[PDB]
């Protein structure tokens, strides 16, 4: 165990020990979106695909952008693990981040 | 309840615990339903369910030429496994509907 701290029986501050193991809608939607790849190699999941609405408005039946209706991102709070500095098996932290999964169409 | 031997085998991670509208206005509106599991973190997950099979026009009626569809997300949860100790957690991934969007069939 060189380079990486240690915890006491006490378990204070509180810790958990985690056992390690072993679609077209974005295009057809009235509030269409692009997916953008977010990568953080110290985060689990390392890779998160985040939505970004194509336009400020929504798309009518003739395929035009009308500004009476708004494209808005549907956001989700999700859990991630972050391996914090100094980057040890015991340096992890839980985090909750807000990510856009897609876009929906709303009356202002 | 097990023990953190120095060994750390089988491998674990130790995780430091922290000191801490659109659903109604959408053309594909949704209800939120409460999912609670008292051995999971987050214990409570709010899952979307689209109000109708169709979308809602500007006069507020349900027209069936356009479809309300659920947008899904794979998310991380911790499950506290038996025997239910601070050191008995396991990572898991579940698919949950976050909301609904409006699509041309």
């Amino acid at each position, epitope marked *: *165990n*060189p*380079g*990486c701290p240690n915890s006491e029986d006490k378990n204070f501050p509180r810790t958990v020990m985690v056992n*390690l*193991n*072993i679609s077209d809608y974005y295009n057809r939607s009235t509030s269409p979106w692009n997916l953008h790849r977010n990568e953080d*190699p*110290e985060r689990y999941p*390392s890779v998160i695909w985040e939505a970004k609405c194509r336009h400020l408005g929504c798309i009518n039946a003739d395929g035009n952008v009308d500004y009476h209706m708004n494209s808005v991102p549907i956001q989700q709070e999700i859990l991630v693990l972050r*391996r914090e500095p100094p*980057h040890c*098996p015991n340096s992890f932290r839980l985090e909750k981040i807000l990510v856009s999964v897609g876009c929906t169409c709303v009356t202002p | 309840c097990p023990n953190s031997e*120095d*060994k*750390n*085998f*089988p*491998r674990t*991670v130790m995780v430091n615990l922290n000191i801490h509208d659109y659903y109604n206005r959408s053309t594909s509106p949704w209800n939120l339903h409460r999912n609670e599991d008292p051995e999971r973190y987050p214990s409570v997950i709010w899952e979307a369910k689209c109000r109708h099979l169709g979308c809602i026009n500007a006069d507020g009626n349900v027209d069936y030429h356009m479809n309300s569809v659920p947008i899904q997300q794979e998310i991380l949860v911790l499950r506290r496994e038996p025997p239910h100790c601070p050191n008995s957690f396991r990572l898991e991934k579940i698919l949950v509907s976050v909301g609904c969007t409006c699509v041309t069939p």
Partner: antibody, heavy 119, light 108 residues
């Protein structure tokens, strides 16, 4: 000063056995795992098994179970790998190496023992 | 078993070049990836442990990086003393498995 010293080169016929010794110094012998890894000619390392001298607990690669036996003697700070029913393909340099478990690395290695299995 | 794919199996490069070797595991190994060096006529030597940490005394021209299933080993400036075979090894779960090796040589 953490150090592992192995017995000398061996030449054996197919079907024979070989027993290689690994003498540890410079650390608390009972509390670290010692492993055996071999290098067959040309390229390639391969893990054989490991022993914790303190308890006598062992772990073997499935390929070698029943054919390789590891033992340890706390009174002499020595571990032994015995490999039976030797075949030509067992020709290799055999190493012992200490295996701190937290990261699962072999940090100190013996000098190697050349085992030639030839008819 | 966790299968380790190491590439390439061999290579040659000039003094002072940058060499990159890859190692890929068949499942997430949580940064438990070590790198060994075996110079001709010598015992293997631990160079890097836990993906990126340098064993005591190892030159800093050697480094490692990666996460999940995908790892790299890099020699920043190849020196003549660096002619050797390099191996990766996962230390995540039994049995301990190795990549197939990369034999490194010097072009003059």
């Amino acid at each position: 000063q953490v150090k592992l010293v192995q017995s000398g080169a061996e030449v054996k016929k197919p079907g024979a056995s070989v027993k290689v010794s690994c003498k540890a110094s410079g650390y608390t012998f009972s509390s670290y795992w010692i492993a055996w890894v071999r290098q067959a000619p040309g390229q390639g390392l391969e893990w054989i098994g490991e022993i914790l001298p303190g308890s006598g607990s062992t772990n073997y690669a499935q390929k070698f179970q029943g054919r390789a036996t590891m033992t340890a003697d706390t009174s002499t700070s020595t571990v032994y790998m015995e490999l039976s029913s030797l075949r030509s393909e067992d020709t290799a340099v055999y190493y012992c190496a200490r295996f701190p478990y937290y990261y699962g690395n072999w940090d100190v290695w013996g000098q190697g023992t050349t085992v030639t299995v030839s008819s | 078993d966790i299968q380790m794919t190491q590439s390439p199996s061999s290579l040659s490069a000039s003094v002072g070049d940058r060499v990159t070797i890859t190692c890929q595991a068949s499942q997430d190994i949580w940064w438990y990836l070590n790198w060994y060096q075996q110079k001709p006529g010598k015992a293997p030597k631990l160079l890097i442990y836990y993906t990126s940490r340098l064993h005591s005394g190892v030159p800093s021209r050697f480094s490692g990086s990666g996460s999940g299933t995908d790892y790299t080993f890099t020699i920043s400036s190849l020196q003549p003393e660096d002619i050797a075979t390099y191996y990766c090894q996962q230390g995540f779960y039994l049995p301990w498995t190795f990549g197939g090796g990369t034999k490194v040589e010097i072009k003059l």
